[PDB]
Amino acid sequence: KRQRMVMKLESDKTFPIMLEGKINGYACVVGGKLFRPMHVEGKIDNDVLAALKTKKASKYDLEYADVPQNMRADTFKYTHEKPQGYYSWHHGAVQYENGRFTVPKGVGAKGDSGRPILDNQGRVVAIVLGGVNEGSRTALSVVMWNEKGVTVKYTPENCEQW
Amino acid sequence: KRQRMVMKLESDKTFPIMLEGKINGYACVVGGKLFRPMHVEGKIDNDVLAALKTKKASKYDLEYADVPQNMRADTFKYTHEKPQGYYSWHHGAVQYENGRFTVPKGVGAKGDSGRPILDNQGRVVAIVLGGVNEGSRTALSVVMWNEKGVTVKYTPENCEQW
């Protein structure tokens, strides 16, 4: 499955945040709008997107920008269907339960910010912003949206910026 | 079967309450919080948990404490799904009916306090604190929590501290 997960991720257009040749995070376009982890320093690996001026969101420590409709023709598709089970991301699978994402220990670290979470249909259900070590596993800090279109950021107490 | 159920209980990490080398009860962590039967004298077989200062609950004769996030990595999962039928515990199976737990006579005694009752999913539905002789069987004094999040203690009149 994870093989197929990566293949779908490869089809999905994603761009790392390059600074002095180092990836400090990741950024992509969802719902026809560009997003970037604010805590991450550097520029997106895309001159076209980098040419766009972003707006800040301190509350959630995120930046965003509007994408031209012609480029909106193909962007990431979000869904509200977030049932318990397992989802997919760059670093393999992720366990979703109690409204929380958890993964095996040693998975995820500083600079991985921006990695989206996809369902079985390849639809976005959340975006990974950070996480915190939880013994045999780690708890992820993510952002998700209600069916009412409400933006909610879930961050474990004293979670580290991953 | 009871072998299988106990084997799963063995996989679950539990810590007895040691006093002068004698087990007077049991204590464990559920939902990332430590619980201990107050009527039980002695100290838990766990320095890390013992290092924690507990709060008292006279109403239920119970003590509890907050567990470090790192130690919350793997704790017991509680559920509110408590249908009539049979559940599992250290001393085999247990019958649940009329909101009460009952077992064959000669099962359970002083020092067994702290033993939880789990379902087929390994979820906790109640914790055994004591019991009372009821002819061919015995009625257990237990604590359980409703879907409303209400702490409810079921204790027969003049029930014995088991």
**Inter-residue contact B118 to B86 (CB < 8 Å):** no
Q: Are B66 and B34 in contact (CB under 8 A)?
A: yes
CA distance, residue B72 to nearest chain A CA (Å): 7
3-state SS of chain A? CHHHHHHHHHHCCCEEEEECCEEEEEEEEECCEEEEECCCCCEECCHHHHCCCCEEEHHHCEEEEECCHHHHCCCECECCCCCCEEEEECCEEEEEECCEEEEECCCCCCCCCCCEEECCCCCEEEEEEEEEEECCEEEEEEEEECCCCCEEEECCCCCECC
In a 3-state reduction of DSSP, which class is residue A65?
Answer: strand
Of B34, B50, B52, which Cα lies nearest the Cα of B42? B50
CB A142 within 8 A of CB A100: no
Q: What is the dihedral of CA B32, B33, B37, B40, to 10 degrees?
A: 90
B74 to chain A, any CB pair closer than 8 A? The answer is: yes
Name the residue among A115, A149, A145 with its Cα closest to residue A129: A115
**Any idea which residues of B carry the catalytic annotation?**
39, 61, 113
Verify whether the Cβ–Cβ distance B73 to A137 is below 8 Å: yes
Amino acid at A90: H
C-alpha B161/C-alpha A42 separation (Å) is: 65
Token readout for B141 is 């004094």
Q: Which among B40, B100, B80 is positioned nearest to B28, based on CA atoms?
A: B40
To test the contact with chain B by mutation, choose from A100, A133, A134 the residue with the greatest count of B C-beta atoms within 10 A, namely: A134
Query: Distance (Å, rounded) from C-alpha B68 to C-alpha B72?
Result: 6
Burial class (CB in 10 A: 0-12, 13-18, 19+), A10: exposed
B73 touches chain A (CB under 8 A): yes
Q: Which two tokens stand for residue A94?
A: 């992720």
Give the method of determination.
cryo-EM
State the distance between the two ends of chain B, measured CA to CA, in whole angstroms. 25
Residues 114-153 of A with CB under 8 A from B: 132-137
List CB contacts of B84: < 8 A, sequence separation 6 or more: B96, B97
* Residue type at position A140: L
Beta bridge partners of residue B116, listed in sequence order: B127
The position carrying tokens 């991985």 is A112
Q: Around B113, how many Cα atoms within 13 Å sit in the side-chain half-sphere?
A: 27
Nearest to B124 by CA among B38, B9, B4: B9
Residue B84 is given by DSSP the state S
CA distance B128 to B120: 17
Declared resolution, Å: 4.8
Give the SS3 label for residue B111.
coil
Q: What residue type is A112 in one-letter code? A: D
